RNA sequence: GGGUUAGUCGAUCCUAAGAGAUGGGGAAGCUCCGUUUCAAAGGCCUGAUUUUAUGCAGGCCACCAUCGAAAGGGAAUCCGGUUAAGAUUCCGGAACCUGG
């Protein structure tokens, strides 16, 4: 029974040391040496900035023409929604003038791009930095012009309420004010009385109802955006090493199939089934 | 051990003694980025493996077995060329647009004429570092030679600038010091 | 090869599908240490639905947490069961599984 | 000769030590002091051979990656044998009631992994197979509707099932996001997981074929999109024991959106009654008589519909019998439930 | 023809002067040198070595085959009886040693 206390202290000590040294090495050395950088990436990223900034410029032009309704010279008057499902079918449906639920998924962005400030502003107002963060959002017509801008960095789609249920009942943090803290702390979804404590005004109790009224959006959905404000997803592949590098290559081929980059400013919104996707990422 | 002792005593007795100038042209070799882009070139022109070959054979044979004789059309296979006598054979036509030459071969004398031979034939040779890296791009253990003749039109412009790059980086830099007796400095 | 993939697609289901159990034959193994789950018949002993006794665990909460983890966990097992509305979310349960695995 | 050092046995078997830890747990080989004859039994085993073959396979995968030849690595991965677990399951548990006796620990881990969120060390496919098999196990129970015992706790939900002999004591922790413990190592529980998964897999085969219906259970996809449960599965074709099976016969419930849907859903399925939850309704009420709800203020306050806090279901099945619902009416206080243990 | 019966008496085990394979090196070669020497010369401990989720990781120890004594070194048995011819070895009783 001595092995219990001994290895229990050892694993906690070595795990804290490993996490602290991993926190104190990664941002330290990559700014310490910081590199003998390269001569190629400095130019390829410059071309990638030219492309991405120009497509966001063309997006801003065409959306100002649609929004001010000074429209005489555009390609397409209405926007469109593309649907990638399974030699892979892509269904196109015209845009809906109706608010809806979406579960956006912050993807790792394309290869070597320095991203501008207009896209960074939209992503920062949507808390999508530090990728593998899919977050819930509202489809309207005024929130929609952001979706053309974030589309090369996120993926869009309709999730299922069973999958949304399993997301919320398995994952989720709450920034919380508690008994005695310095109070940057986040608790996972356990106490329904903590829920009704901060949400007794809106009358929101019993996180099953938070799932329900994220599904509903009839009374309050952005209150759930204030309360369940943080989100985290896992990295899908174990990564390095032979058995997982093949998996990385196959899934990069899958992502290169499923994501299409438009750069046309009449870019259709691309929806993928999040339901099979959360068999992977949750 | 003995073999560790000998493999450490090897390359000491070489550099201690005067090497003839037809050797030490090797290790006066290609630098980092140019060899990197050369490998990026030749991985575009990997030869077909035995598995991929047999797989395409089974595909077309099942096609003819149904029959379902689809068409009779294929442009050509393009690949690197790697047989040593075949590499020499592609010279003295000339057909070799680029030749990579491994520095390390244990019978060095298999190789020693090839820089002078591509010199007189005007073939843009380059001495590459490591025959294992040649074997990797040609699905062998080692290859020690790498000739490349046929190139698609998508890649032909990259080929010419790579040739000019090598002739700038190899033929200009190392030509006079190629004539000099290397080594001789004790260990 | 199309027929081969057709074969493999059926054989993947057919291999995992078939199974057979057999008849009564005991394994009289002296070295095998098969034990049932403890506290299986002690579920009324856990308070676990608005019951009184775990309030004593409120008195000995510092006594529980002051003890070793092998003594802390069983002592902190019973706790004040309020209602349906909250279940604290099972920090102890994974450690219990890992401890049982170490016992095996 | 009776005791063998783990280093000695692991070098005689020429296996890696972590895979020796796999094999000991895997065959039930028990003690760094191990029986010589048990290692002699272990000395020839094809799963050991396929483990060593997998080591050489990963070595060939490393040379495939280091040579950069992707397609040969694809050929290696596709043309790859998989070690199965099934033969030592049958020669470990020949008698099927011994598998029924030892399914009890096998359920519990797989339910806990079905609760567990997706991580890096535990794949989602692992969790997918866990949740699938656990939903299958629950869906089989709701066929014969045969448990008898219910337990409500801060630690788990302990149900034992009266099926073909012993009552089997499986537990499900509530579907809450759990802080992962850094203290544990998954490398053992994954071996237990895979062993129990294959074992319970073939036991589900004999229980589905013995119950006379198809061992793969079909589900409507849109029913799964409503709720990922046992009720997702449809169960095909090719009495009930009194009173607990078909307790609350012809009985229509209205579970709220407030209640925990899962274990109450499973209890009503153990009763055979129907489930109507408004949480299922907003995905997109004639016969409903009873509301299971735990709320202080009830809005529409239908006198025809009976308002009940859920312990009534937890107490009726622990008795097997009906009790009055005045205590279970909100907001009346409840008897401190001490389950029959 | 018959006769020599042992845990305890010896050999066996240890090393002595000395002999002598191996690693190596000489020699046209039969073979000669050399004996721990210019050798990768084995066998012990720990491991949820905590994540890469089906592949061994982290350490510890330090000289050397074998033969060579019925007088050197060395676990332990005595009395009495008995045979044509045997006995600290058989018979009767009484002891001890080693290993488990």
UniProtKB/Swiss-Prot annotation, chain A:
A GO biological process held by the record = ribosomal large subunit biogenesis
* InterPro entries linked to this entry: Ribo_uL30_ferredoxin-like_sf (IPR036919), Ribosomal_uL30 (IPR039699), Ribosomal_uL30_CS (IPR018038), Ribosomal_uL30_euk_arc (IPR035808), Ribosomal_uL30_ferredoxin-like (IPR016082)
What molecular function does GO assign, one term? RNA binding
Family annotation (SUPFAM superfamilies):
Ribosomal protein L30p/L7e
Q: What is this protein called?
A: Ribosome biogenesis protein RLP7
Q: Identify one Pfam family in the record.
A: Ribosomal_L30
According to the UniProt entry, which residues carry Phosphoserine? 238
Subcellular localization is given as: Nucleus, Nucleolus
Q: What is its main location?
A: nucleus
Name the job this protein performs.
Involved in the biogenesis of the 60S ribosomal subunit. May act as a specificity factor that binds precursor rRNAs and tethers the enzymes that carry out the early 5' to 3' exonucleolytic reactions that generate the mature rRNAs.
Tell me the PANTHER family matching this sequence. Answer: 60S RIBOSOMAL PROTEIN L7, RIBOSOME BIOGENESIS PROTEIN RLP7
Q: What else is known?
A: Present with 7720 molecules/cell in log phase SD medium.
**Entry keyword annotation includes Aminoacyl-tRNA synthetase:** no
- Basic and acidic residues compositional bias: what residue ranges? 7-26
Note whether Nucleus occurs among the keywords: yes
Q: Which family does it belong to?
A: Belongs to the universal ribosomal protein uL30 family.
Record's GO cellular component terms: cytosolic large ribosomal subunit; nucleolus; preribosome, large subunit precursor
Lineage start:
Eukaryota, Fungi, Dikarya, Ascomycota, Saccharomycotina
Region Disordered: list its residue ranges.
1-33
UniProt keywords (A-Z) are:
Acetylation, Nucleus, Phosphoprotein, Ribosome biogenesis, RNA-binding
UniProtKB/Swiss-Prot annotation, chain B:
Q: What is this protein called?
A: Large ribosomal subunit protein eL8A
Function of this protein? Answer: Component of the ribosome, a large ribonucleoprotein complex responsible for the synthesis of proteins in the cell. The small ribosomal subunit (SSU) binds messenger RNAs (mRNAs) and translates the encoded message by selecting cognate aminoacyl-transfer RNA (tRNA) molecules. The large subunit (LSU) contains the ribosomal catalytic site termed the peptidyl transferase center (PTC), which catalyzes the formation of peptide bonds, thereby polymerizing the amino acids delivered by tRNAs into a polypeptide chain.
Q: What is its main location?
A: cytoplasm
List the Gene Ontology MF annotations in alphabetical order: RNA binding; structural constituent of ribosome
- Keywords, A to Z? Cytoplasm, Ribonucleoprotein, Ribosomal protein
Q: Name one GO cellular component term.
A: cytosol
Question: What does the subunit section of this Swiss-Prot or TrEMBL entry state?
Answer: Component of the large ribosomal subunit (LSU). Mature yeast ribosomes consist of a small (40S) and a large (60S) subunit. The 40S small subunit contains 1 molecule of ribosomal RNA (18S rRNA) and 33 different proteins (encoded by 57 genes). The large 60S subunit contains 3 rRNA molecules (25S, 5.8S and 5S rRNA) and 46 different proteins (encoded by 81 genes).
Anything else known = Present with 238000 molecules/cell in log phase SD medium.
Gene name on record?
RPL8A
The Gene Ontology biological process annotation of the record reads: cytoplasmic translation; maturation of LSU-rRNA
Q: Which residues cross the membrane?
A: none
Superkingdom is Eukaryota
**Cell location:** Cytoplasm
Electron transport among keywords = no
Similarity comment: family membership: Belongs to the eukaryotic ribosomal protein eL8 family.
Which organism does this record belong to? Answer: Saccharomyces cerevisiae (strain ATCC 204508 / S288c) (Baker's yeast)
Curated annotation (Swiss-Prot), chain C:
Taxonomy, top ranks, is:
Eukaryota, Fungi, Dikarya, Ascomycota, Saccharomycotina
Further comment found in the protein's record: Present with 2680 molecules/cell in log phase SD medium.
Subunit structure and binding partners = Component of the NOP7 complex, composed of ERB1, NOP7 and YTM1. The complex is held together by ERB1, which interacts with NOP7 via its N-terminal domain and with YTM1 via a high-affinity interaction between the seven-bladed beta-propeller domains of the 2 proteins. The NOP7 complex associates with the 66S pre-ribosome. Also interacts with NOG1.
Supply the gene name: ERB1
Subcellular location field? Nucleus, Nucleolus; Nucleus, Nucleoplasm
Q: Where is the signal peptide?
A: none
Q: What does this protein do?
A: Component of the NOP7 complex, which is required for maturation of the 25S and 5.8S ribosomal RNAs and formation of the 60S ribosome.
Question: Its family?
Answer: Belongs to the WD repeat BOP1/ERB1 family.
Full protein name: Ribosome biogenesis protein ERB1
User: What part of the full protein is here?
Assistant: 372 to 394 of 807
